[PDB]
């Protein structure tokens, strides 16, 4: 469905997604300052995971977070489309 | 011997996924190669074949041992001819998520692939068969499918259409059975 976010701290969030593909090698998480020349940061979680922790965020700053499913049928390229949201911590 | 499968076009990821879940004795997936170091949760021989010598994978690539390979994040990744052949020789259709360019490479390896293109009838049709995307995304998928058909029609074993994903999937299943003799 959608990408869910919960703020764990002004520097850290917990993002969650709905397992739609059954045969996923891993999910790829990328996050970066919403509108920013700075390259994106990224990591992975096993295809069994539907949640991930992102910390080290600048508080109050808008970040673009996207999650890519990499299926077992693929060597690296992800399934399309990825799911994404824009989020800033603090409220 | 089971012919490996490449499904391309809108909803191909859902088709790949449901084929394996619904007929796990007739379909399988192969284990790709990478030169990136293994992650703690990964298992050699299951997630990837973790190649120690980048130079070794490079020779294999130049020797045409991979039906598809590239560099991503300074590491090499490929789907190998042998890995596909190993699945097919178990009598399982190897479900592949690869570029259309790989179809030729499979034919050169005498692997006799089945390639099926899902053709959207229109932009509206994209939204009929994929009810999980925006109209903005549907037009991207429509544009890409158009360009896919224009470049790779000769590689397709079949082109299938439908007013719903159920109709697409029914045709995909029937085509694979027919081509499986």
Swiss-Prot record, chain B:
Gene Ontology cellular-component annotations: AMPA glutamate receptor complex; cell junction; cell periphery; cell-cell junction; cerebellar mossy fiber; cortical cytoskeleton; cytoplasm; cytosol
UniProt GO BP: AMPA glutamate receptor clustering; cell-cell adhesion; cellular response to potassium ion; cerebral cortex development; chemical synaptic transmission; dendritic spine morphogenesis; dendritic spine organization; establishment of protein localization
Guanylate kinase-like domain span: 2-177
UniProt modified residues of type Phosphotyrosine: 48
Tissues of expression: Expressed in brain (at protein level). Detected in juxtaparanodal zones in the central nervous system and at nerve terminal plexuses of basket cells in the cerebellum. Expressed in cerebrum. Expressed in hippocampal neurons (at protein level). Isoform 1 and isoform 2: highly expressed in cerebellum, cortex, hippocampus, and corpus striatum.
GO MF terms, alphabetically ordered: acetylcholine receptor binding; beta-1 adrenergic receptor binding; beta-2 adrenergic receptor binding; D1 dopamine receptor binding; frizzled binding; glutamate receptor binding; ionotropic glutamate receptor binding; kinase binding
Subcellular location: Cell membrane; Postsynaptic density; Synapse; Cytoplasm
PTM description: Palmitoylated. Palmitoylation is required for targeting to postsynaptic density, plasma membrane and synapses. Palmitoylation by ZDHHC2 occurs when the synaptic activity decreases and induces DLG4 synaptic clustering. Palmitoylation by ZDHHC15 regulates trafficking to the postsynaptic density and function in synaptogenesis. Palmitoylation may play a role in glutamate receptor GRIA1 synapse clustering. Depalmitoylated by ABHD17A and ABHD17B and to a lesser extent by ABHD17C, ABHD12, ABHD13, LYPLA1 and LYPLA2.
Major localisation: membrane
Record carries keyword Phosphoprotein: yes
Modified residues (Phosphoserine): 74, 122
Keywords: Cell membrane, Cell projection, Cytoplasm, Lipoprotein, Membrane, Palmitate, Phosphoprotein, Repeat, SH3 domain, Synapse, Ubl conjugation
Domain comment as written in the entry: The PDZ domain 3 mediates interaction with ADR1B. The L27 domain near the N-terminus of isoform 2 is required for HGS/HRS-dependent targeting to postsynaptic density.
Biological function: Postsynaptic scaffolding protein that plays a critical role in synaptogenesis and synaptic plasticity by providing a platform for the postsynaptic clustering of crucial synaptic proteins. Interacts with the cytoplasmic tail of NMDA receptor subunits and shaker-type potassium channels. Required for synaptic plasticity associated with NMDA receptor signaling. Overexpression or depletion of DLG4 changes the ratio of excitatory to inhibitory synapses in hippocampal neurons. May reduce the amplitude of ASIC3 acid-evoked currents by retaining the channel intracellularly.
Family under the similarity heading: Belongs to the MAGUK family.
Assembly and binders: Interacts through its PDZ domains with ANO2 and NETO1. Interacts with KCNJ4. Interacts through its first two PDZ domains with GRIN2A, GRIN2B, GRIN2C and GRIN2D. Interacts with ERBB4. Interacts with KCNA1, KCNA2, KCNA3 and KCNA4. Interacts with LRRC4 and LRRC4B. Interacts with SYNGAP1. Interacts with ASIC3. Interacts with SEMA4C. Interacts with CXADR. Interacts with KCND2. Interacts (via first PDZ domain) with CRIPT. Interacts through its first PDZ domain with GRIK2 and KCNA4. Interacts through its second PDZ domain with the PDZ domain of NOS1 or the C-terminus of CAPON.
Protein name: Disks large homolog 4
Gene designation: Dlg4
Residues of the full protein shown: 533 to 713 of 724
